[model samples]
Target chain A: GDHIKVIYFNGRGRAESILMTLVAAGVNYEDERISFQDWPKIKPTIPGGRLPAVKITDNHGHVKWMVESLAIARYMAKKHHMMGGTEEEYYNVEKLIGQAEDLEHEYYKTLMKPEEEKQKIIKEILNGKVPVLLDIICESLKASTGKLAVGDKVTLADLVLIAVIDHVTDLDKEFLTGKYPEIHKHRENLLASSPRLAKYLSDRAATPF
Target chain B: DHIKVIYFNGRGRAESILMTLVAAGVNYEDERISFQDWPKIKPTIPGGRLPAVKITDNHGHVKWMVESLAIARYMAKKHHMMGGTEEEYYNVEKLIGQAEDLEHEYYKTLMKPEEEKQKIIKEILNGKVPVLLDIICESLKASTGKLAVGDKVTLADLVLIAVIDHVTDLDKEFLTGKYPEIHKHRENLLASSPRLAKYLSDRAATPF
Candidate 1:
């Protein structure tokens, strides 16, 4: 494991943001796509019983594997300059990362529940939690000049926010486009954040659900 | 506009942070809000959540933070107890996130009904616990002694020790009687640290 290797299910789910960070940072990593059918046998072998794991090889030729996709995301963010410049800015990005995670649990409700539960979850998120969370992020984006999520610099928040917006857009693109002008600006001019991020988003259009 | 940690009276999500603050010798006020008082206090927090940190400098500048891990990171950053190297710190973070997930699963079982709890207990006891402990035990094999990742003690070790303690209090046999390396790891830390030992004894009667 001389290089970074991302091991996840073939579908772009929890692990998509991790991939986006690596791509955005211009870091070369191997994407190990495994099938869902093969997971049961493989699941017990991995740590923490989760996917979106990483196998990182240090310069000493020692290999280390870690699970929990957000950790991987932060590690990548740290490696890249995406954490932001100032200490306070880094703290803001971390908070936004946490916010994305909290919202993600709500997003899962839309996917994992029965059709009845799904609508209730979707409605709860769409009408209530989504607006509250988006407004906080939107206000910050407005405060900054570059349409970046944190402190005028392209940080992990941009990646995390876009990943979330992409998921929401898949469900209802209109919600993102019509309701939030600030987020709409970020979505439309993501290239203004960073060249690699814009490149990754454009290429990711073909990735499967 | 001062350092205040807001959490329930119970030592649950905020214990690790308390322990960290103690070990780091950091001073902060603990606002142990009652469950009844939570609603009145909730909206004041940034995300309307507990296990939050509100920092107020001498300039009267106020900063409110949410999420336990993020709070822990901010605290750990202040303490310089994150890890030895850059990679080590990130690895510690990875383990902390893993520990949170494992701990979350335990919480889920508790909040469920008895029948649903039984199913969760079986899944956790049989399937989840063994796999997780095995990896942790395996990782410790690389450490100098019973340490989880790096040469010295790390935040990952602290997290793993807290998690194992929580799980074992629920089911003793599943931890001490089964996972030798993990047990040894915890045993080593318990014996080594005065801070953890003192804290554990002071709060020993509480299960959570």
Candidate 2:
């Protein structure tokens, strides 16, 4: 059996989506969380001095470390056949993932602001950019034959969308209350369908963004 | 066999993709949209973004893919420019990720205040670029051939060349002369294929 380990901080920051994808794919792996206290010592050992790295040990016992959040997630998603079936579908999946990443980056920047300006930036994001991005996602979902983001399967695009929505809602309580009902419903059905994912989400520790 | 690449007249994000297609010897319509025309055309785009590629297969089926890196990777893979083995593929990806991080920092630096911008650029040119070039040189040294990943030229090599070129363009005095490995790789890769050579020589200059 192969041994997979995900190394990141205790927070849900960048590793949460990766963990969620791993669970949804039914892959058994170790979730190694590093505390801030231990990071200084551990930082030097990491390849890129970055968190959310994946250490994979193949059945042959050969080991490799992969870094970069999106790249690692894409590697795992492709391994589990979550990317897409066809070349066109693969591009579509990647495009949505890119759009989701853009939204996440915008939302992420709001978190780095001073306490006084944080809410203002958040409000701007919610009012200005979020809706434009949400419209594109919703329209794509609407055009898709099934309820999933791309083809008739749960792809990385769907996982990324769910991750972004969850992250946005964590910042703003009113995010998913009544807005984007289609997305809300999509999230609901996806988690309901995957017990492993639902369990992981419920059992995981909540962290401040 | 129809591929249409739409982007602004500048060489901001679309240049690497255009270069990749040229290196692959694939014919594509390089559709350049002026900034003045972008506002009128933006609404028609799927994701309201430039650097998107519209690909039509033999069946006349059409698909539009957006995002600069995604389009580049797609084109690279389609044209066998990604890498040979799985390990090589991930290595190529890791290098691409690193190059993009540098590019992001460079762009962010460009947006700073004038004095602050010069200071940061100085630091980057004197400090960060050398460190990255050293790391890239090490990777090249480890590889079998003159290329980055495997024997053949891959996306990793193209992206590295593009980023180094952009850095050099940022300051005429900033040179890759110190890093002989990278300098030689760029020169040889530029002349590797006739189509790529022609594209590099004939492409119009932009202020970006």
Candidate 3:
């Protein structure tokens, strides 16, 4: 038998998309959440000294632990055939993933700032950067033949898009369905089209970010 | 089809990609824009970022791709430099990620005040650099040959070389008489490919 385990903190700092990808792929894995207090003690024990590591044990009993959330997610995505059907589609998926991570990084930069500085950065993110990225994403969707980010199916690109939008929404609730109706509908249709994803999103524990 | 790599006239992030392409034996036009021309050309590039890769097909259809690692990985995958198996692929990615993190740390330290920058650089050289080198040495221990992932050169080795170059550039004495394994790995990898060695020797010097 094969086994999989995802280790991360209690909240969805970086592991939510990884979890969502695994869930969407219909892969049975252990979602191992650790407390922040325990993280200090456990930090030195993990590879790369980071959370959001995936431990996989194949049927041959060979075990491997992979770190880096995006890398882990991509590994699973590629293995499960969620990467895309063709070379062009694969490149499109990677571009979208890169864009989504860029947005996530912008939001994360604001978290460590002073309250006033944080507010300023968040405003710039919402008003300036968000629109530009959304426009780019909308253009990508328009170029695509289907509603999802890249291909006809729910690839890792779509999951990352949904996860990034959710992360940004923690800053402003109306950020999602407000300015970009196409993106709004993209999220809605993606969830409605996949029961597993929709249920995972609804049933998963709620966290602020 | 032809590939064109656009970047500044420096080895900031594009060096590894250039090295990878050379190692893969892919012919590409390396268009290095000057700092003066960057402002005017910035808007025309995809994602408005440096180190963009432009792929033009035979029919003259052009596609622009941004992000250095993505472009490097794309070339590596197409040329069979990304490792042989799924496990090996992730191993290469993990090492790349670790190298990138180290690069980020070095850049972050550069952003500090002068006095603090010196202190941090000392700490990095004494503490972080050696720790990472130790880990990398251990990873190489598992490899069957001089290469990081498999017998042949992979992106993992290219990225490791890039980060080591970045750090050692900060202090010339950093890698001297230290990390014999890494030294041997770098020496053997450069010797393994004529194109790579030529590019490294002929490439213009940059402050980065």
Question: Could you say which candidate leads in DockQ?
Answer: 2
Looking at model 1 chain A, report the run of 10 residues with the lowest lDDT sum: A200-209
Better-scoring candidate (DockQ), 2 or 3: 2
Give the DockQ (2 decimals) of all models. Answer: 0.43, 0.48, 0.43
* Candidate 3: clashing pairs of residues: none
**Model 1 clash pairs?**
none
DockQ of 2: 0.48
Point out the worst 10-residue segment of candidate 3 chain B by lDDT: B199-208
lDDT of 3 by residue, B1-208 (tens): 7989899845778877888988988889988999888888888886677888888999999988776776777778877887788777777776776677677667757557889888888888877778777767767776767777867888888988888888887788877887887888788788876777778778654666
Better of 1 and 2 by TM-score: 2
lDDT order of candidates, top first: 3, 2, 1
Candidate 2 ranges beyond 4 A from true positions? A59-62, A111-113, A204-209, B39-47, B56-62, B109-145, B179-181, B203-208
Kindly state the number of residue pairs that clash in model 1. Answer: 0
